[PDB]
Nucleic acid binder design. Structure first.
Ligand code: MG
Ligand code: ZN
Ligand code: ZN
Ligand code: ZN
Lengths: 196, 263, 168, 49, 65, 133, 85, 114, 141, 43, 159, 559
DNA sequence: CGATCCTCTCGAT
RNA sequence: AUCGAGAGG
């Protein structure tokens, strides 16, 4: 994530050759979607990138402190003084073909954070395993090799669909399921099942 | 001579600025791609750690070791270990480096790429000597030691391509520009008032004639004449990054031609 | 005029026009008897209920009252000819299409409608922003809306926050 | 760089979370609901520090 | 947490320029901008590498063992 | 077969409504004092100005996968400068005698009005627009 | 007791989505358990795809007992039930 | 953990062969060559050179998924011309072009002083 | 020397605060269009001045570049996430025996800082990297 | 860590709202999303 | 208020009309006021519509209400859905709420009502009044681990 | 509740979700390791014996393999340990618990599952890497973004259980929602954005790309369409090549505003025999709109056909855009020097309006209407002058943005962003409210201690005069912060409240289903509706249709 | 007697 | 297991 409430998982890794490139030969370490911008309205993110680009060029720390008189225009002036189009845009060539892109890419340095929650500490699959003692139901948690909970909300979904037998298998074959002997008179779990 | 043409503007020990005139864009780019990913080089692929009383972790150190540029001049004389018939490695497929450093002085002791030493039989081919451009002569700073601090490790440097791991990249960035005046209209300049005033004029604009407005759009024109600057890390010289680039590509196009007769 | 009804007739017509390559110059091979009776017969065939009895027959008749309105307004003598310019081939194809599409459009016994409706209201309720409204510009627009209102409705609120009488 | 301010209870670092309480000895008046018989109320949360 | 060998973006060797960089600042009394360019770090990806580096090893080395 | 319509037009207006490559042309026939033409032209490929006198032709000849020119001996029905291919979509009779045709050249629209078009232009997936001088 | 005769059958002549999903399921189950196949499996091997063919060619020998709310039922043979959808 | 070995990008597996010729189901004299353990470096370069052939009616390539190295190249030629030969000619033309470039850069490099 | 004073909300009630020292009290009598619109003098009976408006924020929020240019929740969101971002929690990490310890190989000091980061020890123990980012539609992954 | 050591908890008329009086005292941004939003504060 | 009403020519026309809005309800009295349109009078209090105009009007108003909540949110739900909910509350003769007070107090299977709320106490008077569970509810068959009579299981398959 | 209506279950997997432009709508990208854990109990029949044998021989560690072999008398053979794991001569009637393979039906879900569309049957596609992968067009019914979400996967263990999924729960068969009688899946983001760009009259593509784009469509007939232009260049339009993704017999008409069969501005839509004639393709055409390509395609061609459509449309657009590119910079929030001058003066005239009204209120010259306070009116008035100001300021800004403006572009396509977004970012954020009213005097007669007592002015009671571009002042910041919070507070409330509502609705109507006599009844068999929805029609099979006898003049009716 | 779903981790008795 | 805290969407 960026310092602007911009959560994001790696969708894919591309090697240098497949990456869009600058005429200088610069290439991104990261590609964020333009669609994650207009709704969120996190303008500071775009400004940070602008300022940070001038910072790396001039070899000066960027003043991204709040209540100041640092303007986008003022930063844009200095970036142009470096031979780059003032609003962060840069001509980029497609890694696959080498052809120029019809769109110029707003590209520059942006401080990104490597957060907790990594696929590998999260993946979990279970296909029969540890059963709780009382309930005789699959145990809880990835850590204990547990069974995922097919809650009522999920039960309701299946009903809607009209899948009577998938709902039965989910609640019997996977999870629970037991064979009890009933008295045809009192109808209770009394019967002393002396099998064999 | 015949097809693709070259005019070298600038030439250095680490950079080559040249024009790739009378060439297809698919060719200019595939060349740029091979220049990045596919030229084989020599890089450390195995670290056996005997001692580590350092501030840094085993694998942290092992990783930086992989990144140190090593002489790759005679890389084709060295074999890929996966092709070699030896059990594991030898001198036909690998170069063996040693690193031993101890905090002798009270003052912080630095560990450079100069401190790595070749143990393996080189068989007189220019290979494995860590690349040094540092004026002082002590290449890359691997590590720093205090006092009781020690580091004893053995490295196995192997042939490989960037396509497997970036350490095997013989070059840094390749600069690449075509049509500095946008006469091909391959891009559509984003502006506020004037595209011309807002977009900085290209270095290579001097090398081409400006569009001239009193003329219709050249619809038939194709992209030829490519302004390029290939920069090498030093493992291989710059002339070689481009020649070996051509070769690698020539060789991979040849493998297809050969696969057709094979089937 | 616009109301959710099964069988998109506009599309059936468009499809017949393309399928049969209708030409706006050549005069149709249709009759008033063909169009007038044709539509009338199609109506007797748009089944929803089946039992031979009066109650179930009147139930059926009622169930298709509105669709038949659309059907008539769309497939009327002048429109069929002056507008659509159908041929007897294209016209009979249109009739069999509606007959089929309608019978498909019917609900299947077994459909778990109760849950469906409950989820159908629940889902968009969780998409509700502002327990107030955007009517905040005027200080005479204060009416219980959003989730608190839906909460009032469902609980059958004796003491509602915004009781209002709209006098005509 | 460690700032302290925490404890070490059985080798575990503990932080006492600042507890927000309504200040005592403060006199406050409150209007009371339409069904309620008392119109307004004056309260005092008298405590000895 | 020591001077990365090679710039993540392009790969230009940067793990041999740190001590040189520090000297240019202290001894030559230059500024970071002109210092980076004197080391031949023309591109900003290569610039952020050294400029933005925090050398925590100097701190870790201070620990007695 | 051959030609379906062929006339000389006088361009009144040429509007690039928020487009850089395309322009909507407004023309009337030099001959008939009723014949209209409103058409989207790619000005980047063939520019058009005001009062420009242009020869417009609608043919149906020079079906299967498109083969690149390959002018090894290839002779196409053009002595023209600008040629499009399109589809007919509406035939609006603007009352009494005045009739109009609608052609989309992959979204580049065209509307030709007059009368004498009659027994030629049909709901053909065909129609090649050819423009010269 | 209880039933409904073949004549005077008010339920849909058209098979429900639920009817065919349960029908294909039950058949796919039989096929998977080495039960005989009543159609020439043209290059086919999947039990559901085989049941689908068996339904397409109307050779599934099963009957839907259509219960009404009062407890009464209407027996419809897969063979007679129309399969539009 | 579910990440495949990087050598799988350029090294052939068990049963894996470089080219796989499959005659196209729809078009006549059209063929689909499946290049295994190959990216845009060869696809684009071959596809581009195939367009330069006047008797080539169609030539397009694709990478159906980025996880896997393989790419598909569709070639359609004129009556009498075998697309395998069209690919053959394309390959040689590329090889010849590369040779010239090698020699010309070599010739130039030898003049450049530094 | 009584040049500064400690004020609680109860007392804050009885006082008049100027935001800026300069911009809030010199004299009155062209403008930068780019610069934000700031209201005139109006009230001029000041008893105190704000030491620095950026001080209204705490630890997590003092790390955000230009929060004054962001929608209000994005600032709450980042405050929750900064606490989940790896860095160098302490120099003695190599010496502590703790349940989970996440340490960034080569942490980078941000190219875009807040004046508050000097006291927050951020450029000394950073938690993140200065990635070259492209906002672009590419493979659509 | 720093942030943890400067946390406030408020147990149980409008406790969750960023009150005017919080100016310069409690952080306007720093608060958990849901459950204890506005109840858990940072100085 | 704005009003779409037919003109003498036949087409619908916009005709603005004066309407009175009230903070408070006394339907019984206000409807019998001279000068008003008693056939048109409305209240968001559907409970008052239920007492004054009857159950069917109660149902009608109850839908108009549920509708307006969804509508205001710019959202659209198919009539039949809300229609069903509204009828469920209605079929009882009065207004049965979707709370443990309302719907859950019904004659439905003891095991199905306990699945909602007041779990134990529902099952307590189930034993006390000696209730017979129909076992026709989704919930009972979910508890019993049997194929519920839901779409797929709403019919028996024969040979 | 925790053990009976819901319970923990076997054959269940979970992980982080990721976007896949190369996966099919109905597919799900299952990580090898997961597929390797989860099994299907497959009975041995001559049809599978050869595949099953090889699989039992592949083992539990090589993917297209298995763990466990069940024989007669019920005993399990653990393939990872068994000495005879290398042996095993399979018998018919035995079971092979095989690894989850490509094209198996799987129940895929995202919690909260308040929709039947929240649980769908997917086609397994065993892939490398650790994330579950899905087609971006299945994002909405699940309500999932890839910001760190996790999804749940379930495996049917029976032949009828796998049939129930593929015949009733399958993604293509859920495309058209019965909830809102419109589709519940459409074209989104890059695809929605690129499609607009590709479908411009100005968008002209050539041979090289055309051929590539054509090949990209799997179902492609192999016929190169005739270029719309055959003059100095064989040049195709975007509309042309995209029309390739559209199947034959597809007819679509719209008419928006300017739309006149000659569509001057390229508005509305016209598609005949699956070929776009005019009109730029955006959200109205290609979104989950009532009368869009998708509702038409599903009802005309079929679910499986429509499902394929997404992929085809994705494949072309995605590719075209991959090569065209699209960004968003700081420059896209920047409005003209003259525009800002106008925006600034627009707010300034609102300020006077408020002040003059304040002067009027303070003079007792204010005369409030019936039913509301002299103050209640004042506040409502000021609130209005200030909202108007922001709307007008924002419109001034919106009008200044060119068609090259990336933010304007996203709005135009309908991918991301609305007016307010432009307005707040580039001209003026506007007034902030808490509890409906504007910023309150939390301090005695003051919103903040930087203000004088009794100040009702815009700036004082929370009016943010600045844009996010210009930046907010400390006061503006704190006030924006106050309203910001209310949003988060009631977000938390709204989610926990609606959650309870949902359950009570679901419990109340659980047992309501259409019986074999078209009746709608509960578990007691009590009539709720005599004909479902009063017409006995299924909700998905319906759509808004114009009844032509009701409208128009009696003159036009007769005509 | 109710007051969102699901999920992860850790600590203590 | 229980009880509790923190966290993710
Ligand atoms: Mg999410
Ligand atoms: Zn008994
Ligand atoms: Zn060897
Ligand atoms: Zn670099």
């Amino acid at each position: 994530a960026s310092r602007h409430g911009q959560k994001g998982t790696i969708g894919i890794t591309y090697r240098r050759e497949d990456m869009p490139f600058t005429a200088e030969g610069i290439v991104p370490d990261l590609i964020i979607n333009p669609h994650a911008i207009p709704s969120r309205m996190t303008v500071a993110h775009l400004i940070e990138c602008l300022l940070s680009k001038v910072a790396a060029l001039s070899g000066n720390e960027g003043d991204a402190s709040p209540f100041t008189d640092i303007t986008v225009e003022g930063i844009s002036k200095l970036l142009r003084e470096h031979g780059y189009q003032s609003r962060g845009f840069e001509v980029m060539y497609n890694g696959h073909t080498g052809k120029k892109l019809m769109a110029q890419i707003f590209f520059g340095p942006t401080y990104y954070q490597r957060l907790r929650h990594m696929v590998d500490d999260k993946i979990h699959a279970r296909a029969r395993g540890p059963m709780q003692v009382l309930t005789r139901q699959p145990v809880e948690g990835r850590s204990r090799d547990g069974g995922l909970r097919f809650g009522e909300m999920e039960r309701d979904c299946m009903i809607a669909h009209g899948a009577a037998s998938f709902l039965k298998e989910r609640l019997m074959e996977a999870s629970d399921a037991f064979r009890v002997h009933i008295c045809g008179i009192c109808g209770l779990m009394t019967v002393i099942a002396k099998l064999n | 001579e015949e097809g693709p043409q070259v005019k070298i503007r600038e030439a250095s020990k680490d950079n080559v600025d040249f024009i790739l005139s009378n060439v297809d864009l698919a060719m200019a780019n595939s060349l740029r791609r091979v220049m990045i990913a596919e030229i084989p080089t020599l890089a450390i692929d195995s670290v056996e750690v005997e001692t580590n009383t350092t501030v840094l972790a085993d694998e942290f150190i092992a990783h930086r070791l992989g990144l140190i540029p090593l002489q790759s001049m005679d890389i084709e004389q060295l074999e890929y270990s996966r092709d070699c018939f030896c059990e594991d490695h030898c001198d036909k497929c690998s170069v063996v480096l040693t690193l031993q450093a101890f905090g002798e002085s009270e003052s912080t002791t630095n560990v450079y790429s100069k401190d790595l030493v070749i143990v393996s039989n080189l068989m007189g081919r220019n290979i494995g000597h860590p690349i040094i451009q540092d004026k002082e002569g002590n290449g890359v700073l691997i590590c720093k030691l205090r006092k009781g601090q020690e580091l004893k490790l053995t490295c196995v440097a192997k042939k490989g391509i960037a396509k497997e791991h970036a350490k095997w990249g013989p070059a840094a960035a390749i600069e690449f520009e075509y049509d500095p005046w946008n006469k091909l209209k391959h891009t559509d300049y984003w502006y506020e008032q004037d595209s011309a005033k807002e977009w900085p004029q290209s270095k290579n604009c001097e090398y081409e004639d400006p569009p001239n407005e009193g003329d219709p759009f050249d619809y038939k024109a194709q992209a030829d004449t490519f302004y390029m600057n290939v920069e090498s890390v030093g493992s291989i010289p710059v002339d070689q990054v481009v020649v070996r680039g051509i070769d690698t590509l020539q060789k991979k196009v040849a493998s297809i031609l050969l696969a057709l007769t094979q089937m | 005029a616009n109301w959710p009804l099964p069988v998109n007739i506009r599309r059936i017509i468009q499809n017949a026009q393309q399928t049969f390559h209708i030409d706006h110059t050549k005069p149709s091979d249709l009759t008033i008897k063909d169009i007038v009776l044709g539509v009338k017969d199609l109506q007797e065939n748009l089944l929803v209920l089946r039992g031979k009895n009066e109650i179930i027959q009147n139930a059926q008749r009622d169930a298709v009252t509105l669709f038949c309105c659309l059907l008539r307004s769309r497939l009327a003598t002048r429109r069929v000819l002056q507008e659509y310019r159908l041929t007897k081939q294209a016209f009979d194809w249109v009739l069999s299409n509606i007959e089929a599409q309608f019978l498909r459009s019917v609900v299947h016994p077994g459909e778990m409608v109760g849950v469906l409706a409950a989820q159908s209201i629940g889902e968009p309720a969780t998409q509700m922003t502002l327990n107030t409204f955007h009517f905040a510009g005027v200080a005479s627009k204060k009416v219980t809306s959003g989730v608190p209102r839906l909460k009032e409705i469902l609980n059958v609120a004796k003491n509602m926050k915004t009781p209002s009488l709209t006098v005509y | 760089f460690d700032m302290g301010g925490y404890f070490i209870i059985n080798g575990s670092e503990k932080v006492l979370i600042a507890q927000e309480r309504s200040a005592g000895n403060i006199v406050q008046v409150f209007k009371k609901a339409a069904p309620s018989p008392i119109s307004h109320v004056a309260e005092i949360r008298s405590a000895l520090e | 947490m020591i001077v990365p060998v090679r710039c993540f973006s392009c790969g230009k060797v940067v793990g041999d320029k740190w001590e040189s960089y520090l000297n240019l600042l202290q001894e030559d009394e230059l500024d970071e901008g002109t210092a980076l360019s004197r080391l031949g770090l023309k591109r900003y990806c290569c610039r952020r590498m050294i400029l933005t580096h925090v050398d925590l090893i100097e701190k870790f080395l201070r620990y007695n063992p | 077969s051959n030609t379906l319509f062929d006339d000389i037009f006088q361009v009144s207006e040429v509007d690039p409504g928020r487009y850089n490559k395309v322009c909507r042309i407004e023309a009337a026939s030099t001959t008939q004092d009723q014949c209209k033409l409103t058409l989207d032209i790619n000005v980047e490929l063939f520019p058009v100005a005001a009062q420009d006198s242009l020869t417009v032709t609608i043919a149906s000849s020079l079906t299967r996968s498109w083969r690149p020119p390959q002018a090894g001996d290839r002779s196409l029905a053009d002595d023209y400068d600008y040629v499009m291919y399109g589809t007919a979509y509406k035939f609006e009779e603007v009352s009494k005698d005045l009739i109009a045709v609608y052609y989309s050249f992959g979204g580049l629209l065209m509307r030709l009005e007059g009368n004498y078009r009659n027994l030629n232009n049909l709901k053909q997936e065909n129609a090649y627009l050819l423009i010269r001088r | 007791e209880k039933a409904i005769p073949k004549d005077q059958r008010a339920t849909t002549p058209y098979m429900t989505k639920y009817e065919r999903a349960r029908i294909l399921g039950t058949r796919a189950l039989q096929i998977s358990m080495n039960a005989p196949v009543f159609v020439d499996l043209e290059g086919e091997t999947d039990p559901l795809r085989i049941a689908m063919k068996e339904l397409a060619e109307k050779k599934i020998p099963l009957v839907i007992r259509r219960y009404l709310p009062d407890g009464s039922f209407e027996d419809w043979s897969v063979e007679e039930l129309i399969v539009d959808l | 953990m579910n990440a495949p070995d990087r050598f799988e990008l350029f090294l052939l597996g068990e049963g894996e062969s470089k080219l796989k010729i499959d005659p196209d189901t729809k078009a006549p004299n059209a063929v689909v060559i499946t290049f295994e353990k190959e990216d845009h470096t060869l696809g684009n370069l071959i596809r581009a050179e195939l367009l330069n052939d006047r008797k080539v009616l169609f030539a397009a390539y694709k990478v159906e998924h980025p996880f896997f190295a393989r790419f598909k190249l569709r070639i359609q030629t004129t009556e009498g011309y075998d697309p395998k030969d069209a690919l053959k000619n394309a390959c040689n033309s590329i090889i010849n072009k590369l040779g010239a470039l090698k020699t010309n850069f070599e010739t130039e490099w030898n003049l450049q002083t530094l | 020397e009584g040049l500064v004073e400690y004020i609680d909300a109860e007392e804050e009630e009885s006082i008049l605060i100027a935001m800026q020292p300069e911009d809030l009290e010199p004299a009155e009598a062209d403008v930068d269009p780019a610069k934000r619109i700031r209201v005139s003098h109006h009230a001029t009976t000041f008893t105190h001045c704000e030491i620095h408006p950026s001080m209204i924020l705490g630890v997590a929020a003092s790390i955000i570049p230009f929060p004054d240019h962001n929608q209000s929740p994005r600032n709450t969101y980042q405050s929750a996430m900064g606490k989940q971002a790896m860095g160098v929690f302490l120099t003695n990490y190599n010496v502590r025996m703790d349940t989970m310890a996440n340490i960034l190989y080569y942490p980078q000091k941000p190219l875009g800082t807040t004046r508050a980061m000097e006291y927050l020890k951020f450029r000394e123990l950073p938690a993140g990297q200065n990635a070259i980012v492209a906002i672009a539609c590419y493979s659509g992954y | 860590t720093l942030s943890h050591l400067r946390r406030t908890n408020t147990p149980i008329a409008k406790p969750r709202q960023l009150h005017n009086t919080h100016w310069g005292l409690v952080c306007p941004a720093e608060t958990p999303e849901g459950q204890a939003c506005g109840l858990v504060k940072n100085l | 208020y704005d009003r779409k009403v037919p003109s003498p020519t036949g087409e619908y026309v916009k005709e603005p009309e004066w309407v009175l809005e009230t903070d408070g309800v006394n339907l019984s009295e206000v409807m019998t006021v001279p000068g008003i349109d008693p056939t048109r009078i409305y209240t968001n209090s559907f409970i008052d519509i239920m007492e004054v105009l009857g159950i069917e009007a109660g149902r009608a108003a109850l839908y108009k209400e549920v509708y307006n909540v969804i509508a205001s949110d710019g959202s659209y739900v198919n009539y039949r859905h809300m229609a069903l909910l509204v009828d469920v509350m209605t079929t009882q003769g009065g207004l049965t709420s979707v709370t443990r007070h309302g719907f859950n107090r019904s004659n439905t299977g003891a095991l199905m009502r306990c699945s909602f709320e007041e779990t134990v106490e529902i099952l307590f008077e189930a034993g006390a009044s000696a209730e017979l569970d129909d076992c026709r509810g989704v919930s009972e068959n979910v508890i019993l681990g049997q194929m519920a009579p839901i779409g797929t299981g709403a019919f028996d398959v024969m040979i | 509740r925790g053990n009976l209506m819901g319970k923990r279950v076997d054959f269940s997997a979970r992980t982080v979700i990721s976007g896949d432009p190369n996966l099919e709508l109905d597919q799900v990208g299952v990580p090898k390791s997961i597929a390797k854990t989860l099994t299907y109990p497959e009975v041995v029949t001559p049809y599978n014996i050869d595949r099953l044998t090889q699989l039992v021989r592949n083992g539990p560690n090589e993917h297209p393999g298995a763990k466990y072999v069940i024989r007669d008398s019920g005993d399990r053979i653990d393939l990872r340990y068994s000495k005879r794991a290398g042996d095993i001569q399979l018998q018919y009637g035995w079971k092979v618990e095989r690894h989850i393979m490509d094209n198996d039906p799987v129940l895929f879900n995202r919690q909260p599952s308040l929709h039947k569309m929240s649980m769908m049957a997917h086609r397994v596609k065993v892939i490398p890497y650790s994330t579950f992968r899905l087609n971006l067009s299945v994002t909405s019914p699940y309500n999932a973004d890839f910001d760190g979400d996790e999804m749940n996967l379930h495996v049917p263990q029976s032949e009828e259980t796998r049939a129930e999924l593929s015949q009733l729960c399958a993604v293509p068969l859920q495309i058209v929602s019965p909830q809102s009688n419109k589709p519940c899946m459409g074209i989104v983001q890059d695809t929605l954005c690129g499609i607009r760009k590709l479908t411009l009259r100005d968008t002209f593509i050539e041979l090289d790309q055309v051929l590539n784009m054509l090949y990209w469509v799997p179902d492609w007939d192999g016929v190169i369409p005739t270029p719309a232009i055959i003059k100095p260049k064989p040049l195709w339009s975007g509309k042309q090549i995209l029309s390739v993704a559209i199947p034959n017999g597809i007819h679509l008409q719209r008419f928006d505003e300017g739309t006149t069969l000659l569509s001057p501005k390229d508005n509305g839509m016209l598609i005949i025999d699956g070929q776009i004639i005019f009109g730029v393709v955006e959200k109205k055409t290609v979104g989950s709109s009532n009368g869009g390509l998708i509702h038409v395609v599903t009802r005309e061609k079929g679910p499986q056909v429509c499902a394929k459509l997404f992929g085809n449309i994705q494949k072309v657009v995605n590719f075209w855009l991959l090569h065209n590119g699209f960004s968003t910079g700081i420059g896209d929030t920047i409005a003209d020097g003259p525009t800002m001058r106008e925006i600034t003066e627009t707010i300034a005239e609102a300020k006077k309006k408020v002040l003059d009204v304040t002067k009027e209120a303070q003079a007792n010259l204010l005369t409030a209407k019936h039913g509301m306070t002299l103050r209640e009116s004042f506040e409502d008035n000021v609130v209005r002058f200030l909202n108007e100001a922001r709307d007008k300021a924002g419109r001034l800004a919106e009008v200044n943005l060119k068609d090259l403006n990336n933010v304007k572009q996203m709005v135009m396509a309908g991918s991301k962003g609305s007016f307010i977004n432009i307005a707040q970012m580039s001209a003026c954020v506007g007034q902030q409210s808490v509890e409906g009213k504007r910023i309150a005097f939390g301090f005695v007669d003051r919103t903040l201690p930087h203000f004088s007592k009794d100040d009702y002015s815009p700036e004082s009671k929370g009016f943010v005069e600045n844009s996010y571009l210009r930046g907010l002042t400390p006061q503006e910041f704190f006030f924006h912060a106050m309203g910001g919070r209310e949003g988060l507070i009631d977000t938390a409330v709204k989610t926990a409240e609606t959650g309870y509502i949902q359950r009570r609705l679901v419990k109340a109507l659980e047992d309501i289903m259409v019986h074999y006599d078209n009746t709608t009844r509960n578990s007691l068999g009590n009539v709720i509706q005599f004909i479902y929805g009063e017409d006995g029609m299924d909700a998905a099979h319906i759509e808004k249709q114009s009844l032509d006898t009701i409208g128009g003049s009696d003159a036009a009716f007769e005509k």
